Each structure stands twice: as structure tokens, then as C-alpha cells.
């Protein structure tokens, strides 16, 4: 019988080879995730359709910011083959009310609060 699948704990304990390859720091972990859905939930069990609706990822290739807490981690971990997780980086400060109109999300994951389009 095909059922839900417990993923062993050891899969989510990274090695120093990871931290060289990806750009993470295990000390001082990041604020929030940007999650993209890249794989439809049709031809997937009803629990993964449920978790995609709860995470708010219904439209494919639409970024969604989720907290980096354990509970969001568990919901993400069930649907980790449908999504793409990138760290939400903040190069400058997080947008204060002044520039919170004039922002941008960059494809590298980072949110730059001054949206220009002119030659540099």
C-alpha cells in the first residue's frame, strides 16, 4: 500500500561540503524562504494537494515567502519534490515604509528595496 512517507532525519543534516557548495551558513540561519511551485499536484496524492493549498503555492512559478520555522519546515518537507526553496536574502535593510513601494525581488533570492531600471 502506497502511503505517506517518513523522510529520515539524516537527510536534513547538512555536511560542510554543502556549506561550501551552496551559500549557507549553519550558524546564523536565514529568516524566510522563497518557495516556488515547479511541479503540478495532479498525479500526486491528496495530502500533497492539501499541503500545496495550505502553503499558498497554487500558481506554478510564483514565489511565496514562508517562515523558516519547524512547522512550515514540516509542511515543506512533505512536498519537497514539487517546490523550490531559496533563502530570502536582504542585501540592504528590510524595506522601511519609505521605499516599501519601490522594491524588487531579484532572481538570486534577494530583495533590493530601490527599484531602478536606468543604465548604471
Amino acid at each position: 500500500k502506497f502511503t505517506r512517507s517518513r523522510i529520515p532525519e539524516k537527510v536534513f543534516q547538512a555536511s560542510p561540503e554543502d556549506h561550501e557548495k551552496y551559500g549557507g551558513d549553519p550558524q546564523n540561519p536565514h529568516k524566510l524562504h522563497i518557495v516556488t511551485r515547479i511541479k503540478s499536484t495532479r498525479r500526486r496524492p491528496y495530502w500533497e494537494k492539501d499541503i500545496i493549498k495550505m502553503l499558498g503555492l497554487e500558481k506554478a512559478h510564483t514565489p511565496q515567502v514562508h517562515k523558516n520555522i519547524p512547522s512550515v519546515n514540516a509542511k515543506l518537507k512533505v512536498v519537497k519534490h514539487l517546490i523550490r526553496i531559496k533563502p530570502l536574502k536582504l542585501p540592504q535593510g528590510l524595506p522601511a515604509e519609505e521605499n516599501m513601494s519601490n522594491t524588487c525581488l531579484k532572481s538570486t533570492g534577494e530583495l533590493v528595496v530601490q527599484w531602478h531600471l536606468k543604465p548604471v
Binding site: 517562515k67 516599501m100 532572481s107
Partner: protein
């Protein structure tokens, strides 16, 4: 050819954000700027709501950490004060 676009920090789809969607398509010959395009108003508003959510979530995260530090410090004050008299 949109893997090369992703490497360079450009978007995979150039019709996403770029100069060719988020500049204004036209202006009067006199120089008066156009009314803003309705797709660009929609997209700026999507961007508004996204940044609002990021600020809300960051405040909730760090307020949770500070509140837990207060719970621990008040518990330790009570620990030190119950070990008197």
C-alpha cells in the same frame, strides 16, 4: 535561451521584469508622461503585498524570539527569588 539568463542574474524570461516590461511604452510628443499601464499597476501592487508580507513575517519571527527570551529571563528571576527567604 534562459539558463544563461539565470546565471547572469537576469530573469529566465525576459518578459518578466526588465526594461522591456517595466518602462512605459509611450509618451506624448510634448513630453508629458503616459498614464501608467494597467499591467504595471497590477505588478507593482503584487510587489507591494509581497514586501508587506515579508515585513510582517520578519516582525513575527523576531518578536517571537524576544518574547521567548523574556519568558526565560523571568523564569530565571523567579528561580533566583524562590531560592531565598
Amino acid at each position: 535561451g534562459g539558463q544563461w539568463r539565470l546565471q547572469q542574474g537576469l530573469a529566465a524570461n525576459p518578459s518578466g521584469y526588465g526594461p522591456l516590461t517595466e518602462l512605459p511604452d509611450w509618451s506624448y510628443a510634448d513630453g508629458r508622461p503616459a498614464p501608467p499601464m494597467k499591467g504595471q499597476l497590477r505588478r507593482k501592487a503584487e510587489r507591494e503585498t509581497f514586501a508587506r508580507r515579508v515585513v510582517l513575517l520578519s516582525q513575527e519571527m523576531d518578536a517571537g524570539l524576544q518574547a521567548w527570551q523574556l519568558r526565560q529571563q523571568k523564569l530565571q528571576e523567579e528561580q533566583r527569588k524562590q531560592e531565598n527567604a
